Design a binder for this molecule. Structure first.
Ligand SMILES: O=C(O)c1cc(-c2ccc(CNC(=S)c3ccc(-c4ccc(C(=O)O)o4)cc3)cc2)n(-c2ccc(Cl)c(Cl)c2)n1
Length: 122
């Protein structure tokens, strides 16, 4: 209730602008999809929301793949990010790798996209 109050509004901008990595923000998963990988473990890319912004530049550490494959981490769930790393590509784009996270509320217990977040412009 006041659902957006459940999310760390402003965390996406803090990660991408300030380079803040000590925060443990609470974010909503909007979408998850596999990337094209070949002969190596699958890799998942996530569209995440902090209630104000969405950002599609997240990938999951492969050690967390079971959370996706066993359906605990899925679209609409709310999770707390306990550890993440930022990397920057040759072309300037930043990628956030999610290393440790906790699902606070399952997709089924939330059920909808929270608020009206808008895409973050890098
Ligand atoms: O096949 C595809 O569709 C497809 C493909 C990619 C795409 C794929 C790869 C890279 C480069 N590899 C980077 S950044 C990377 C990957 C893993 C790690 C890492 C550290 C620790 C761990 C772990 O434990 O698993 O993993 C650190 C850096 C860029 C892009 N993308 C893609 C393009 C743009 C963005 Cl912003 C994002 Cl997040 C993904 N789409």
């Amino acid at each position: 209730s006041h659902m957006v109050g459940q999310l760390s509004r402003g965390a996406i901008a803090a990660i991408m602008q300030k380079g803040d990595t000590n925060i443990k923000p609470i974010l909503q998963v909007i979408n998850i999809r596999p990337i094209t990988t070949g002969n190596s473990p699958p890799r998942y890319r996530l569209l995440m929301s902090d209630g104000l912004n969405t950002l599609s530049s997240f990938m999951l550490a492969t050690q967390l793949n079971p959370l996706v494959e066993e359906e605990q981490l899925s679209s609409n769930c709310v999770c707390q990010i306990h550890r993440f790393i930022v990397n920057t590509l040759k072309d300037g784009r930043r990628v956030v790798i999610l290393m440790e996270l906790e699902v606070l509320k399952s997709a089924e217990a939330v059920g909808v996209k929270i608020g009206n977040p808008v895409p973050y412009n890098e």
